[PDB]
Amino acid sequence: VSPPPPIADEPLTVNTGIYLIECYSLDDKAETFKVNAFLSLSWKDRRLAFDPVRSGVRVKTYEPEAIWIPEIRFVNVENARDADVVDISVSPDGTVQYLERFSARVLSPLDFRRYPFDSQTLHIYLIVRSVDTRNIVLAVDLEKVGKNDDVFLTGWDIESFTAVVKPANFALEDRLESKLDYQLRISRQYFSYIPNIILPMLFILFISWTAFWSTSYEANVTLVVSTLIAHIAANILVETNLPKTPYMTYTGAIIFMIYLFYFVAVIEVTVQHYLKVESQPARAASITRASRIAFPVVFLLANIILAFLFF
Amino acid sequence: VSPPPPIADEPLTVNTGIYLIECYSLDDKAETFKVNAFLSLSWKDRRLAFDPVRSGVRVKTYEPEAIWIPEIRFVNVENARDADVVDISVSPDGTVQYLERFSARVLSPLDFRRYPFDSQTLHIYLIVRSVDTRNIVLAVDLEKVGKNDDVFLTGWDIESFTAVVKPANFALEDRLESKLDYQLRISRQYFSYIPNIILPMLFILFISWTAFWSTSYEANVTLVVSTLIAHIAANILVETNLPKTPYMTYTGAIIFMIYLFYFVAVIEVTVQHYLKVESQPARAASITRASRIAFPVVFLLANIILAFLFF
Amino acid sequence: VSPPPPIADEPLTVNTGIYLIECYSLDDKAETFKVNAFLSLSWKDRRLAFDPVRSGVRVKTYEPEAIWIPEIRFVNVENARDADVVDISVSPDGTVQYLERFSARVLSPLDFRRYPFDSQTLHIYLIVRSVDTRNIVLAVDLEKVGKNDDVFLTGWDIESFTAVVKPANFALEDRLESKLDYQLRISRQYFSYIPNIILPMLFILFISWTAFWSTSYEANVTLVVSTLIAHIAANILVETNLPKTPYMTYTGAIIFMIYLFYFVAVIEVTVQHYLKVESQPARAASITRASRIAFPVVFLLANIILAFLFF
Amino acid sequence: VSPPPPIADEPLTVNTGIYLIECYSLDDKAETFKVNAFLSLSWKDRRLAFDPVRSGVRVKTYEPEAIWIPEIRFVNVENARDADVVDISVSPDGTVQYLERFSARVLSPLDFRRYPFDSQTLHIYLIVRSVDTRNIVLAVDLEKVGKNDDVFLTGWDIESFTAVVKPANFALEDRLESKLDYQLRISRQYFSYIPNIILPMLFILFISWTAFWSTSYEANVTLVVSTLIAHIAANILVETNLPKTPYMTYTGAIIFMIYLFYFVAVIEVTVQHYLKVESQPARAASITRASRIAFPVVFLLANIILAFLFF
Amino acid sequence: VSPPPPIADEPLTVNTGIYLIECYSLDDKAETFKVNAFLSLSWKDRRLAFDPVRSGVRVKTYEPEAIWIPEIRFVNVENARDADVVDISVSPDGTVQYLERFSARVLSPLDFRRYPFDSQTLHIYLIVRSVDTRNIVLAVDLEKVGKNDDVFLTGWDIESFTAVVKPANFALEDRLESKLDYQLRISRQYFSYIPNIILPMLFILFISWTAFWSTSYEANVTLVVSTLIAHIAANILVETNLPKTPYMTYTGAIIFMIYLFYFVAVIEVTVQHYLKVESQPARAASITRASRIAFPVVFLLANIILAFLFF
Numbered sequence A, B, C, D, E: 001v002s003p004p005p006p007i008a009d010e011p012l013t014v015n016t017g018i019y020l021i022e023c024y025s026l027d028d029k030a031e032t033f034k035v036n037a038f039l040s041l042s043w044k045d046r047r048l049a050f051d052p053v054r055s056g057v058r059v060k061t062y063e064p065e066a067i068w069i070p071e072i073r074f075v076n077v078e079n080a081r082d083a084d085v086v087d088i089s090v091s092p093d094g095t096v097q098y099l100e101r102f103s104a105r106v107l108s109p110l111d112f113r114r115y116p117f118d119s120q121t122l123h124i125y126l127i128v129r130s131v132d133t134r135n136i137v138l139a140v141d142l143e144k145v146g147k148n149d150d151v152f153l154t155g156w157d158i159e160s161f162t163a164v165v166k167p168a169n170f171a172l173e174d175r176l177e178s179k180l181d182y183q184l185r186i187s188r189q190y191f192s193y194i195p196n197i198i199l200p201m202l203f204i205l206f207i208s209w210t211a212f213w214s215t216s217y218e219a220n221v222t223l224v225v226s227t228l229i230a231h232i233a234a235n236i237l238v239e240t241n242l243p244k245t246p247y248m249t250y251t252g253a254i255i256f257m258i259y260l261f262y263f264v265a266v267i268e269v270t271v272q273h274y275l276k277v278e279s280q281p282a283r284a285a286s287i288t289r290a291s292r293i294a295f296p297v298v299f300l301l302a303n304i305i306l307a308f309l310f311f
């Protein structure tokens, strides 16, 4: 129970492969996702080699404790994976074919810049630490890298699950470390966001703009202020389903922009009333009539500007 | 231990059976449900066979570690099942009768299209991976497939728990995989939804329609706007108890439709007031009188259209 | 390590007893409760018998692995109990006295029909599966069935903890199953509900009825509508602390009834205003004066009707 | 591996000691707190005695499985403690000095009568069950009872951690049980409650009292009703951070009292308006002028009465 | 399996090192953070010495149970760390090089005085208890102390991860304890707080100040009261994401100060109206005109005073 000895002075290549069985619980706020998959490992151990003609069997099955197995770990995991060894098969040349079924909560940062029209690249980093006898290098066996067709992630479209074939070999605490990158590309299902958040938020804003077709300050105050309270409720609802980003998000920009539109509408409503009391409604009517065109035009213009800056 | 050797070149049939003891925690947002059940397994191992006459005993009881047991796993589970082996009995012909009691959180997608008048088909997928010595095929023993009469799922009616007798045999990572489908059919108890969400949401909408029997713009603004705020509160309450679907739900359609009715009511209230100020209330009175009939008629019409499209 | 052999052809009686140490976490929505208790088990194993005179000792102490112990399980538990064996004592006749301390989350449905003036019967079902050698039957040893005096359940009064002495013996998967019923009777502490939810909800309803002593439609709309928003807030607060029941609850009935009172008050307020505008306030004043008596009388009458139907 | 034999007919005294390392997660609603501490145990086992001269060593170190250790449990815990044995030392006379580091979620009821100006006495109950060979009695070794200086409980001031030196010896299931009481005295940090809940709640109430300096019923309705909605929001916020008590709390009393003040203010506002419409404002002005003095005086008076009844 | 014997009378130096792999879940309310890191331990055990010539290997690999490993614990952890031993290597002199990968929830108090423009010093305390044979002293091996470049903490900037090289050696329960301090310095990413909470909270306050450009008491009441309700919503949203501190926070001060500004605005609105009714609007106009300048000036002044007191 030690690493296999090298024939010359070559590092031990451990061929890896992750096959996704179940994908679930993508927490946007925590930037984590739960995964249930197969982990396949393959290496050459010449000490386990046998003659197939004399043995009578073409493959030998071993228990994990009986043979040497590379200590393969995941970098971006909360806790160590819950694994159950499925099978260990040894071919006559000494090539081990290890398979285990694992479940782990993976930590992968998300880019909310384009939310809810955003795409993500979820990562799963495989790692091996080189032993004192010899160095261990990871490899990708594309034949054993894939996903089940049933694999569904609620509110997401699963594009592809590939692996960066070239490992990131580096020094860590005076020992070699071979790191592999498994990438799960996903795109957000933005459909629900339109009738649930986008359109209701636009309607309450358009309702506040009816104050531009009214001279009643008491009714105008009620219109602009109440709809602002509805927008504050909408802002709270959205910001709780998202983490605190050091960058501006597309939704964050719009929500903040809408706050300015309510503030400027309050100013207009205040100015309109002040001029009516000061016995000059001709100045107020012209401002109110201008606002009827200005508010939707500037809103459409600014939205085009924002959409261009983000997409 | 190792798999039992085949007499000819036949695959090993492992007869299965799931008997539900407890069903609980159906998370709609997570599309998961917790289950506590019996898992019965039966296979022929000729190496364990004995003569009942000289043994003196008709059945031999073994501990799990003593004999070979097929590695039976669940496909759609978050983590590996928590199992406690109940009994292992061996008949004289070598037929093993294994029984275990398990508990597992099962991942099964739900169809919210008809919510809260929806029915679901919960799945439990049993799976076995074929070994190098011989292939393992799963079978359904209908005698050991059932459920306890006490089995209750909060807010759901349990119809039936059956199994698709024919297994889905397929190739996975260069090995045969035998997959069985256990189906738990349930229907939602929609009763509570009527006095808690449906009727209160209709009442607040009918209260907004009283603005069609009033000329006071200040009172009308207060009526339509405040009731809209109540509907926004109701929308938030409903959408949090449901996951983000790429398709339209029945409740989602109604909620969204009601938003249009509030918006058009605001427009009516705005138009009515604008005409009263412009000294033409005959035009306003006729629009307001038409709305008294139009709003309930178009609402009833659209609801019939929606109910037909969904049911 | 097999069951004790029968002297004749009698089943093995395993005397049980549950002594509650701690009762906590009664989740109304989940219909679950956490329990920490002692589980006492007693059976006759003649193979363990000894002469007290020759042995010099009255009782022999064994480790769980050394002797045969019946596989006692709980039916209505989420996961298998966390148990620590306290003591195993054997008397000279071969009678084993087993004791363990366990902790388990128990699933017991609750009847919310009379909430918050409801009483519950929490269940703990003990079960044993008969082995092939002989049948195992459960029994109640009332001496070892009880509870600690400190045992407290937050917001509940603990009446009694008894056991149904006669077991439910039945056939399951071609084997005998002996099931015992341990009942924990509790009654809800309804005190808090009066100053926190009942009285504040009645006050906001009485505030809406002040519109019957006002002719100002603008003020009346504000009165009835705002108080309705407060009642919607109260409805949301209550319904979240309760699960979705297929039956009507006492609180559910009142909340729904109060919604009708707000709707009819809106109708009255609308009718009153319509008649004032139509230049016939004598008709409006008489309706408004009638409502001053009708609303509290019909409310008190309907509450008496509801209380009678539920209690 | 059995209890040490008595020299005469004396019970075995097991000297205990708890040294708090970390105190955290005091859940007020659940009435639980998490603790990380050292558990020291000391007893005399003459079978383990040795001559220091012949042995060459003054102290013998044993592994838990090698020697007999008393089964010490905690009464008021959710689940059995997570313990790691630190050290087991045996002096030449046979005195064992056991030490372990544990972590456990402790259930201790809290008295919310004086909340948020309340003090609590958290309990940790140590217990031992007497074996058949001899009786086990617990003792307090004050030298090994203490706490770390860094020990902090968020929003609480830690006064003292002492132990009731005299154990509660009692009979349970025909066996002796020795119970010890470890008391952790804490007092609530009420500072935050003043600018966050107390003062904002008083301000909204004083804002409602401005209706006593106004004749506008429409403005008065808006004043008293809106501020009541703010108080309902405050009531919901407070009651969620507290469990449902069968007794009245200090905060509960104030919140409920404030509801009466809003109701009486609505009555005043209603009466004032009714008299203005009935063409008798001299009666209304006198009532309104009286209320300007009555409301703050009766509020201050009732608060003094309440503070006296609770403190 | 006992500590290594000293050559003279020197304490055993155990060289430590923590290398952060993943940093996540910084709960502000709980004052906890989750960490996934490498724990390296190195000590001299002369009993494990070997001749590389005779053994055939330059470095001997052992399993944890085979050799003596110092009982290294963390002080400020909720529960004992979840560790997986990576490697144990022994050089021919007997120097052990232990490595494990751990995951633990660390308890570290935070200073919210400057929130959300605050910086924190997270602590990780390593500790060893001296055995009876010899004393164990901890040391820092700066070569094995570091962090991964990918290490990200959501909403935080990771400055440095260093260790206090000099251990805190002290007496505890009559035994020596060597304590090391690993410090993770972080600074809050305050960006999000500006468009999400700061600016929307300032806008609603400026909207309330429009009442200084209006004589309509009914509109003014609606303005100041509704915006106060929005500020109460904002206060609740902020205070839930923060724990109850016995000290004043920067955000806590501003929120509380804003409450005074709303109260004084209500007083102004009340005074203005009272004077208009008392037929003296010249006194009211002058107060209202003064408030137009006073409110923004005093607000800016007080904010400068607060920012100076906190920064």
Ligand SMILES: CC(C)c1cccc(C(C)C)c1O
Residues within 6 Å of the ligand: C115, C116, C193, C194, C197, C198, C201, C202, C238, C250, C251, C254, C255, C258
């Ligand atoms: C406290 C709560 C559960 C409750 C009980 C009884 C009556 C009501 C209202 C509807 C008056 C109520 O909300």
Ligand SMILES: CC(C)c1cccc(C(C)C)c1O
Residues within 6 Å of the ligand: E115, E116, E193, E194, E197, E198, E199, E201, E202, E238, E250, E251, E254, E255
């Ligand atoms: C974002 C939040 C924590 C906060 C920080 C700083 C200042 C304010 C006020 C001025 C809005 C504030 O609420």
Ligand SMILES: [Cl-]
Residues within 6 Å of the ligand: A072, A073, A074, A075, A077, A079, A080, A081
């Ligand atoms: Cl891992």
Ligand SMILES: [Cl-]
Residues within 6 Å of the ligand: B072, B073, B074, B075, B077, B079, B080, B081
């Ligand atoms: Cl499984």
Ligand SMILES: [Cl-]
Residues within 6 Å of the ligand: C072, C073, C074, C075, C077, C079, C080, C081
């Ligand atoms: Cl169980």
Ligand SMILES: [Cl-]
Residues within 6 Å of the ligand: D072, D073, D074, D077, D079, D080, D081
């Ligand atoms: Cl314990």
Ligand SMILES: [Cl-]
Residues within 6 Å of the ligand: E072, E073, E074, E075, E077, E079, E080, E081
């Ligand atoms: Cl630890």
Ligand code: NA
Residues within 6 Å of the ligand: A001, A064, A065, A066, A067, A068, A069
């Ligand atoms: Na191995």
Ligand code: NA
Residues within 6 Å of the ligand: B001, B064, B065, B066, B067, B068, B069
């Ligand atoms: Na086996």
Ligand code: NA
Residues within 6 Å of the ligand: C001, C064, C065, C066, C067, C068, C069
């Ligand atoms: Na046993």
Ligand code: NA
Residues within 6 Å of the ligand: D001, D064, D065, D066, D067, D068, D069
């Ligand atoms: Na022992």
Ligand code: NA
Residues within 6 Å of the ligand: E001, E064, E065, E066, E067, E068, E069
């Ligand atoms: Na060791």
Ligand code: NA
Residues within 6 Å of the ligand: A222, B222, C222, D222, E222
């Ligand atoms: Na109003």
